[PDB]
Amino acid sequence: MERIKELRNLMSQSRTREILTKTTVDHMAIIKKYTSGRQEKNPSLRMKWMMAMKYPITADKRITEMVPERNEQGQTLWSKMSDAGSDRVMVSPLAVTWWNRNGPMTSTVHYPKVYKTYFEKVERLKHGTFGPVHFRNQVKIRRRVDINPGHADLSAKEAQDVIMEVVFPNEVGARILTSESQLTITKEKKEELQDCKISPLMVAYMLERELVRKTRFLPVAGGTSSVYIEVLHLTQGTCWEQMYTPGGEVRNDDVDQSLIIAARNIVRRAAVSADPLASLLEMCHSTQIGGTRMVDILRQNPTEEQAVDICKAAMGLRISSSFSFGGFTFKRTSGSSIKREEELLTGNLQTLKIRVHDGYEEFTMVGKRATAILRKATRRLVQLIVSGRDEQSVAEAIIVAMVFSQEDCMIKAVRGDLNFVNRANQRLNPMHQLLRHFQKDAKVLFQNWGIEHIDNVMGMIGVLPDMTPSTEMSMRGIRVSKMGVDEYSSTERVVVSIDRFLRVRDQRGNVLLSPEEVSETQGTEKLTITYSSSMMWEINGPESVLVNTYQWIIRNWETVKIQWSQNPTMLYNKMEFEPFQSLVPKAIRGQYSGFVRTLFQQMRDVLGTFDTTQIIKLLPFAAAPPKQSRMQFSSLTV
Amino acid sequence: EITGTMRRLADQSLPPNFSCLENFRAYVDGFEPNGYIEGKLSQMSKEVNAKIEPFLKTTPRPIRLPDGPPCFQRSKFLLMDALKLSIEDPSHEGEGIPLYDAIKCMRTFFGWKEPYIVKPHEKGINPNYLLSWKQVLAELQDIENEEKIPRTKNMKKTSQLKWALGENMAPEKVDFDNCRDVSDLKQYDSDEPELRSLSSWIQNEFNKACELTDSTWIELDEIGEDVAPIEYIASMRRNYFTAEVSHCRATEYIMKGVYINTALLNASCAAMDDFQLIPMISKCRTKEGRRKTNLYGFIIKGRSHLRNDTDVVNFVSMEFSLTDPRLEPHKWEKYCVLEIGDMLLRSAIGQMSRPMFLYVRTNGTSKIKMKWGMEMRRCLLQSLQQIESMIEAESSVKEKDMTKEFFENKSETWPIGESPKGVEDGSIGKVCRTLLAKSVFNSLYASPQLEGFSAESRKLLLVVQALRDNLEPGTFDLEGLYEAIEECLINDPWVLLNASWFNSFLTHALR
Amino acid sequence: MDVNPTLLFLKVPAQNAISTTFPYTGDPPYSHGTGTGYTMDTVNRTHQYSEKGKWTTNTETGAPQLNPIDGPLPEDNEPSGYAQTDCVLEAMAFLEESHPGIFENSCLETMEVVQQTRVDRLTQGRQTYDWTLNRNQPAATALANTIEVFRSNGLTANESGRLIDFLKDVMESMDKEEMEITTHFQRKRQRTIGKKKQRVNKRSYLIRALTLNTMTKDAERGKLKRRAIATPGMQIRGFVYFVETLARSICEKLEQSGLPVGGNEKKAKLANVVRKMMTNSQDTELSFTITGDNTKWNENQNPRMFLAMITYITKNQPEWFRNVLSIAPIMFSNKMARLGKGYMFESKSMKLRTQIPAEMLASIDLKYFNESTRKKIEKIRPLLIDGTASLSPGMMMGMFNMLSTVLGVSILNLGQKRYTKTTYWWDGLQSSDDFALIVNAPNHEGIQAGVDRFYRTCKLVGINMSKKKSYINRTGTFEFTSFFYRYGFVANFSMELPSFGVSGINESADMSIGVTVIKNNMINNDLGPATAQMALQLFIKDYRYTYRCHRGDTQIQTRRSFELKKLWEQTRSKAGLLVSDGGPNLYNIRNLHIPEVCLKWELMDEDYQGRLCNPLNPFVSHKEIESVNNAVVMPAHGPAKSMEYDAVATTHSWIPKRNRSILNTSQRGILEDEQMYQKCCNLFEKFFPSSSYRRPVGISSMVEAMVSRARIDARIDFESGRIKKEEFAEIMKICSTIEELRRQ
RNA sequence: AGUAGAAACAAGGC
RNA sequence: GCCUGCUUUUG
RNA sequence: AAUCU
């Protein structure tokens, strides 16, 4: 009613009429950023200079009917002079404090729900639990980490339409909402923010900060989750760690990830020790994750991974001998396997190293909206049966199985820019990258796989490149079935035994797991893992391990220098050099050991030869059991 | 489609053996390499080279310093030669009318004389400075009889201050078609500055800036209550830091400059046409916990219509001192020095009656220089940051906090200065004060020469470090680097002193 | 004892104390007058280092242009702009040979970008030289005036809203005889403000479209003498946008580049690359590192080599792509340069001063000038055409840094040991005008030979190395863009020192930025906790003194020391007040990551809480999502970056006032245009609220959509809701009158 | 005079 | 008497 | 146990 009158007042004029009539809506975007200049090249100096003068601030003109021209002392609060390219009028910083001591009031109960992120930080610092401070040698590594983790369901393209429907429900257009999480969030935020008058723009900005994800490169030690990165200025320093545990609730992805990493590191050390099982138990007791102890997560949390399974079985629990790949849950049912550490090329000519497995083996793939049975050999697929619901479910299962097969028909079907490193020369994982490449569409992998005949057994359905069943000839090894419900609930955990050297065995006597199946990969925990035995660096990472090993031997030089001469075998077989040995490759440990021990021995034999740097350098390599040899080395790899 | 004009510009935008864009495109499309770089290298002269000049101990020569008349003083206020009158007023930093405090601190001195000149300026008119002092006194008197101190005193615009503040000195701005046939019409003078040689007083100023004192000069804001252990650790670290830092003359100069530049900027924006009297006031807490107010002198601001960041506001500085100007007159080239009184110090010489001088000057400043002197407290961070780094670098090694060991036990020391019999070491607090004074002097004596010298000497510092680390360093043109360093040493005392220090460093290093 | 801080470097290494060598607590050097002299110097320099080439006269501009390409080979170690085509193309060919598919994929990405992007992308950026006014203006203002003159002449393809159509228009505008423009004036005796039409012949329009503006760069850290820089126009902007898009896409796929990555990404990439080199290197092999800068980098580099590169990278692509990427190096090979403000003259006898514009240096007697300037003008006078100098043989500072990095990596890729055909080899890291080389060989003779071959292979392309500023040591220590690597990168903290004060945006924003830089420097740099507490204290002192907001329990008289005391005495809970309202500071390391309103929200009084945080306040202004909590800040050694600060919209979130000098100038009429456009756009946001969150789209006039939505909302709100019949009839009447005003 | 330092300020515009 | 105190600053 | 600017 009042804005249409303003439109009439504008249209009555001549220049403004000419602007309204002869200006399209796509040109409005350009002229709204038209100006003489709005750039300060030193804003600090301008503030210092302007806050020394009267009337440096600007405000709307309706302040003239809300604040008086001057106060009781006679100080003027606003002027009659107007800003340059605006209707706004110049005012002082006294109008502000006048408003804040004598101005109109409102209700501020909606405010902690709009600005939810900020008040969540508040409540999450209030209910936090501090702990001691530990001084030590700290190594930070630079990584991409999340500031805002966002809503895991919305993908950052649905989130903007959600924001549109909540705040601007009539200006959204044709987009209907499809997912159920969208409708849930929409109704929640729509009944919360019902008749607020803060501003739509600020509500939208804050909903974006709530829902969409946001990353940053920073130097990091300890935890990588977002609740631990907002306080990285307080938990981590150059020489000091501060124990801390935020107060809110934690997502379980972080917990299972951190348990997996912790268990991997623990197993990696424990394997090279003399009694692996005792060391493993002592490490699991003396360690905790996000404040909660590790035994609690190990008893409560069901998670599929080899190292977690060894830990659980060592606690006398029932294991799910299983793992994960591409969102599917694999349980081996036949055969052995060994990795090979090999190298190859792609169709786009990028070179890459991978670990290809040995032996014939069968597997029982499982998933959320599919199911499958798989048989394969070294680098070669043997057969695949599928039980998906929709056709694209079978497509997912087939591309996952093809990647899992490690066949050259898949490697030589890679086309386009597929960079196998990050934007900072960081090695991503090859399997995940291939599996991401073939998820846009795997047209070339289907058109290059092959074709076979079929026996037409069971009336089983044929494969589909693009939804075309072929009931007599089809892709090699790939068949299809159909099920309305689950074939079998394979979530049935078994009882096991363990040797000292961490060989898991079923009730019969066969072998199920071993410290060779755990990954050789070095990850970075999402929750801060805290280890309190005597030295707090023996599960922290390779860099810390190196620095702290050499620092320890420096500090204890006074007794190592004399133990090195008399009874040195009791110095090499020492509990401090075991985290180091986990980094030396298993093939060249004893060769290095024999090399170094012969070095030190003939360094003792002839008189007048002593270099403390050599002894401080080569001791962590003489820890291992000695294998003799005849060759020589110019360097030593770690 | 490229057509018309933009084809022609395309044909005239290629190498010289081409006349059409399309023939060039065809040459590119048919390009297969058949060893061209090898040929062009084989043709090129062997005089085009990158021969490696080794860098050894006997290789680096000293940096040559300029020759000329000795260097004078150029700060905006006196550093070591300054005197303060005090009354022991119990008010904090920004509290209280300053003209009233000034009158009160002038009442407490007995010994005023009829002023007369001791050391003239030799390019000015010294009676005008004398008369300006007398005018200041008359105005301080007629303040008292006004029934309320006004916080802002304007002065009368008379011949003395019009001369001393540069009024109607600018030339008039006209059109070139009205000044063509003028004889001496020429370009603004744009020449190499006058060279000036190093003197001994800058090192004594720096030595006194690094000194302890019997008073406190900085009272810090409160912060929150400490809830975590590391907050308490940081708090004891901070107690030590603040103890070392509040007792230092460099902090006194910080507070002085911040006060004066703040005052000048605010008066300059507020009163652009009026002349204004501005006292130099400071606040301390002496050894017994008593607050003290301190008067260093007076400033008279002139007109300050500053349309631009570099435009200059002129002012007249008056400062009290006890230091005779007849012993280092080359330091006081820009000053007239009067004699204003006598003073009886805590005396073993019966009662002393040492004379008392007033150093008078015309100076000038800009908005950006004021802005940067209005925020000198950042210097306190720089120093302290480095100190904590060192501490942390040992705390990582010996897994414990080491602030107490360093600050109390004086175990570890670092070289700080050169004495007869050679290198002398100091404790972490001495290092802190030395770096603080370095930053303060960088802020007070800032010039483009310092920028240049810092960069070009960073390079040589790093190649020397590479020699000490035994990394086989080398160069391609070292005399070019020296000629580039020496290009920036012209006339600034602070920069020449840094160069002298660098030569001493090369002498004590490179061994 | 006489004190020497430099002797500290006798115990602590230079990299672990390099912060002492940065005098960034003092004012930086500034320029005071004209920059004409530095412009002349750069012109005559780049015509000096390319002088043995051949001269020609353009048929379109009439300008003398110097072509040094495929010129003679150098005979000494002085700079040279004598580039060779065959070696550039061989460099590109071997680059594609080593990293196949790089150009194809980059070209496909850039083709998508070319097809989709819009003209509005030119609105966001830095200032831009407007040929319509012969000075610099913001980007959107220049775009708008250019579009206006185009539509006034007949070029209307940009109505499509795409960029490539605007480029077709600017191309089609060159084939016109007489362009027409409009100019601002104003007269006062009564302030009359109007416009006037004028004409521009074809050659005039060409020199105006091809020219760049020049100015001197203030606030430079690290130099005794001032530098000149250039600013390009509106017509060379979309083309260079696409070219730098292509170059970005390429350089992202190269392990040697450093330009598209910032902050810790940069250092991470550098460190990973150094480790990769030291792993591929052998143990019997000797290894050295050159820390190097290039001299006269932007004067030697020629656009014709860039055209060669472009035509090799677009090999086997559609001709429209090849022809829309070939126009930037063309237009930067026929470019010109405005000289600047001019000079000022002085007479002591008559006591007067005068100014001399740069557009009379060809028609002025040289008696006035001094020797250096006389020589400058004497050399440059041939190249003058309508107040702007021809400048073909080189670039200017700050453009084509990506493609120049591509050439640098092309030269670094010629050390793979299958292209040297020998036992020495090399690799390294490159950013525009800075590099780190690493050379491997079994002896020092091979090291010298590799250094020589790098120097010569780089001179065959126009890349000259500064021997005066470069040095070679063993591997482990080097310097790259003021990053000092010593077996690992090292913290400096003095580059970040001018970021520790009041930023000058508003109370809330300055507060948030002040605490946020402290916690950032705690993360990235090595600012300790105690020093951070001190930083808080000092920041709060500066905050209080600047904004005149002291504790309220103090006796410091300011202009608003009375309002704050009244607020203090009204208030019961005093720990809930903000530092801007005269309250305490509850900040510490524990809680640096929380705003000032949520930190103290349970401590506030409800009346204060509702007054402060009120949407009806007249002080707040939020306009668009890309400017809500985002401020431009100006670091040391960089361009003006944008900082994100977490804050709550309060009555302290005010905007400050404007310059107001333009009232006194002929171009005063831009204010009125701005004002009217802002009226119209504000009303549009009243009708269409999403217009500030999502870009509108449509072809109708604004009034049409406005009155239509008025009618619709009226109907829907009368049917079931608030609107009665009287309001309905009245506003429909107003809509009718709006139609009678627009259609007639 | 003074600030400053390769060109300007020492008020400017109508 | 009127108006102004950054109307042109690379990446 | 990861792949989102």
3-state secondary structure B116-136: EEEECCCCCCHHHHHHHHHHH
Other Cβ atoms less than 10 A from the Cβ of A479: the count is 18
CA–C1' gap, A44 and E5, in angstroms: 16
As given in the structure block, the two tokens for residue B239 are 């107690």
SS3 A537: coil
Residue found by looking up tokens 């509850």 in the block:
C586
Backbone discontinuities in chain A, residue before each (C to N > 2.5 A): none
Minimum-distance nucleotide, CA of C136 to C1' = E8
As given in the structure block, the two tokens for residue C22 are 């940065």
Amino acid at A220: V
Q: What is the resolution of this structure in A?
A: 3.0
- Residues facing residue A53 across a β-bridge: none
- Residues facing residue B299 across a β-bridge: B278, B317
Pick from C474, C469, C487, C431: which is nearest to C15 by CA? C487
CB contact under 8 A, C689 and A101: no
C-alpha span between A231 and A233 (Å, rounded): 5
Report strand pairing: A129-135 vs C471-474: unpaired
Residues 6+ apart with CB under 8 A from C173: C150, C153, C155, C179, C205
SS3 B198: coil
As given in the structure block, the two tokens for residue C573 are 């809970």
Residues of B in contact with C484 (CB under 8 A): 462
As given in the structure block, the two tokens for residue A258 are 């951190």
Q: Is the separation of the CB atoms in C74 and C52 below 8 Å? A: no
Residue found by looking up tokens 């990696």 in the block:
A268
- Find the helix packing angle between C102-116 and C237-252, rounded to 10°: 140
C-alpha span between A227 and A148 (Å, rounded): 9
C-alpha span between C688 and C679 (Å, rounded): 14
C-alpha span between A38 and A29 (Å, rounded): 17
Residue found by looking up tokens 């970005």 in the block:
C248
C-alpha span between A223 and A216 (Å, rounded): 15
Burial class (CB in 10 A: 0-12, 13-18, 19+), C153: middle
User: Does C342 contact strand D, using a CB cutoff of 7 Å?
Assistant: yes
Other Cβ atoms less than 10 A from the Cβ of A120: the count is 15
Pick from C56, C173, C321: which is nearest to B11 by CA? C56
Other Cβ atoms less than 10 A from the Cβ of B246: the count is 18
SS3 assignment for B298-338: EEEECCCCCCCCCCEEEEEEEEEECCCCCCCHHHHCCCEEE
C-alpha span between B127 and B376 (Å, rounded): 36
Q: Is the separation of the CB atoms in A623 and A578 below 8 Å? A: yes
Q: Is the separation of the CB atoms in B330 and B366 below 8 Å? A: no
C-alpha span between A154 and A177 (Å, rounded): 11
Q: Is the separation of the CB atoms in A443 and A395 below 8 Å? A: no
C-alpha span between B505 and C4 (Å, rounded): 9
Q: Is the separation of the CB atoms in C562 and A75 below 8 Å? A: yes
SS3 B162: helix
* H or E stretch covering B423: strand B422-426
- Residues facing residue A134 across a β-bridge: A241
SS3 A203: helix
Q: In chain A, what is the straight-line distance between the N-terminal and C-terminal CA atoms, in Å?
A: 77
**DSSP symbols for C686-727:** HH-GGGGTS----SSBHHHHHHHHHHHHHHHHHHTSS--HHH
Pick from A306, B78, A285, C670: which is nearest to A297 by CA? A285
CB contact under 8 A, B45 and C73: yes
C-alpha span between A191 and C642 (Å, rounded): 35
Q: Is the separation of the CB atoms in B358 and B319 below 8 Å? A: yes
Pick from A69, A208, A65, A198: which is nearest to C620 by CA? A198
**From residue B6, how far is each of B2, B353, C176 by CA, in Å?**
6, 89, 12
Pick from B236, B255, B215: which is nearest to B388 by CA? B236
CB contact under 8 A, B399 and A132: no
Phi, psi of C663 (to 5 degrees): -60, -30
SS3 A265: helix
**From residue A43, how far is each of A83, B267, C395, C502, C640 by CA, in Å?**
18, 20, 31, 9, 12
As given in the structure block, the two tokens for residue B8 are 């022609």
Q: Which nucleotides of F are covered by protein (CB under 7 A)?
A: 1-5
Residues 6+ apart with CB under 8 A from C623: C692
As given in the structure block, the two tokens for residue C529 are 């906790």
As given in the structure block, the two tokens for residue C592 are 């640096």
Residues A93, A94, A99, A101, Cα dihedral to 10°: 120
Residue found by looking up tokens 């909606």 in the block:
A110
Handedness of CA C307, C308, C312, C317 (dihedral sign): positive
Residues of B in contact with C223 (CB under 8 A): 448, 451-452, 455
Burial class (CB in 10 A: 0-12, 13-18, 19+), A567: exposed
C-alpha span between C254 and C95 (Å, rounded): 10
Handedness of CA B218, B224, B230, B232 (dihedral sign): positive
Q: Is the separation of the CB atoms in A405 and A367 below 8 Å? A: no
C-alpha span between A131 and C140 (Å, rounded): 55
C-alpha span between A352 and A430 (Å, rounded): 8
- Residues facing residue B293 across a β-bridge: B283
As given in the structure block, the two tokens for residue A153 are 């369901």
344-373 of chain B touching strand D, CB 7 A cut-off: 362-366
C-alpha span between A69 and C682 (Å, rounded): 27
- Chain A, chain C: beta-carbon pairs less than 8 Å apart: 371
**DSSP symbols for C216-231:** E--S-SS-SS--EEEE
Give exposure, B313-325, as e/b (b: 16+ Cβ within 10 Å). Answer: bbbbbbbbbebeb
SS3 assignment for B457-502: HHHHHHHHHHHHCCCCCEECCHHHHHHHHCCCCCCCHHHHHHHHHH
Give exposure, C583-593, as e/b (b: 16+ Cβ within 10 Å). Answer: bbbbbbbbbbb
Other Cβ atoms less than 10 A from the Cβ of B401: the count is 18
Q: In chain C, what is the straight-line distance between the N-terminal and C-terminal CA atoms, in Å?
A: 92
Pick from C510, C726, C721: which is nearest to C631 by CA? C510
Q: In chain B, what is the straight-line distance between the N-terminal and C-terminal CA atoms, in Å?
A: 70
Q: Is the separation of the CB atoms in A90 and A58 below 8 Å? A: yes
Residues of A in contact with B397 (CB under 8 A): 137, 551
Pick from B104, B77, B79: which is nearest to B90 by CA? B104
Pick from A64, A53, A328: which is nearest to C618 by CA? A64
**From residue A84, how far is each of B102, B150, B243, C195 by CA, in Å?**
43, 35, 51, 20
**From residue B97, how far is each of B91, B293, C281 by CA, in Å?**
10, 12, 72
Other Cβ atoms less than 10 A from the Cβ of C333: the count is 24
Q: How many helices (H) and strands (E) does chain A have?
A: 26, 23
Pick from C575, C569, C571: which is nearest to C603 by CA? C575
**DSSP symbols for B7-34:** HHHHHTSS-TT---HHHHHHHHHT----
Residues 6+ apart with CB under 8 A from A200: A167, A168, C689, C693
Residues of C in contact with A198 (CB under 8 A): 615, 649
* H or E stretch covering A382: strand A380-386
Q: Is the separation of the CB atoms in A228 and A242 below 8 Å? A: no
Q: Is the separation of the CB atoms in C238 and C230 below 8 Å? A: no
Neighboring chains of B (3 or more beta-carbon pairs < 8 A): A, C
C-alpha span between B376 and C541 (Å, rounded): 12
Rounded to the nearest 5 percent, the helix, strand and coil shares of chain B are 40, 15, 40
Pick from C410, C100, C86: which is nearest to B31 by CA? C86
Q: Is the separation of the CB atoms in C393 and C296 below 8 Å? A: no
**From residue A377, how far is each of B341, B426, C698 by CA, in Å?**
106, 72, 60
CB contact under 8 A, B504 and C323: no
Amino acid at A266: I
C-alpha span between B60 and A255 (Å, rounded): 60
Burial class (CB in 10 A: 0-12, 13-18, 19+), B195: middle
Give exposure, C181-218, as e/b (b: 16+ Cβ within 10 Å). Answer: beebeeeeeeeeeeeeeeebeeeebbbbbbbbbbbbbb
As given in the structure block, the two tokens for residue A55 are 């009337």
* H or E stretch covering A126: helix A116-126
Q: Is the separation of the CB atoms in C281 and C296 below 8 Å? A: no
Report strand pairing: B172-174 vs C352-356: parallel
Burial class (CB in 10 A: 0-12, 13-18, 19+), C101: middle
- Using the 8-state DSSP alphabet, how is residue A214 labeled? E
Phi, psi of A370 (to 5 degrees): -165, -175
- Residues facing residue A353 across a β-bridge: A343
C-alpha span between A433 and B281 (Å, rounded): 69
C-alpha span between B133 and B324 (Å, rounded): 19
C-alpha span between B348 and B343 (Å, rounded): 14
Phi, psi of A328 (to 5 degrees): -100, 155
- Using the 8-state DSSP alphabet, how is residue C559 labeled? T
SS3 assignment for A4-73: HHHHHHHHHCCHHHHHHHCCEHHHHHHHCCCCCCCCCCCHHHHHHHHCCCCCCEEECHHHHHCCCCECCC
Pick from A407, A414, A405: which is nearest to A434 by CA? A414
Mutation site for A-interface testing, chosen from C598, C599, C699 by largest number of A Cβ within 10 Å: C598
As given in the structure block, the two tokens for residue B476 are 């391609």
Greatest alpha-carbon span in chain C: 98
C-alpha span between A357 and A407 (Å, rounded): 11
C-alpha span between A182 and C456 (Å, rounded): 63
Count of alpha carbons within 13 Å of C532, Cβ hemisphere only?
Answer: 30
User: Does A523 contact strand F, using a CB cutoff of 7 Å?
Assistant: yes
Residue found by looking up tokens 């990285």 in the block:
A232
Amino acid at B467: L
Q: Identify the experimental approach.
A: cryo-EM
C-alpha span between A132 and C695 (Å, rounded): 52
Q: Is the separation of the CB atoms in C396 and C212 below 8 Å? A: yes
As given in the structure block, the two tokens for residue C290 are 């050159």
Give exposure, A488-503, as e/b (b: 16+ Cβ within 10 Å). Answer: eeeeeeeebebeeebe
Q: Is the separation of the CB atoms in C473 and C451 below 8 Å? A: no
Residues 6+ apart with CB under 8 A from C266: C258, C481, C483
Alpha carbon A187 to chain centroid, angstroms? 30
Length of chain A: 638
22-41 of chain A touching strand E, CB 7 A cut-off: 36-41
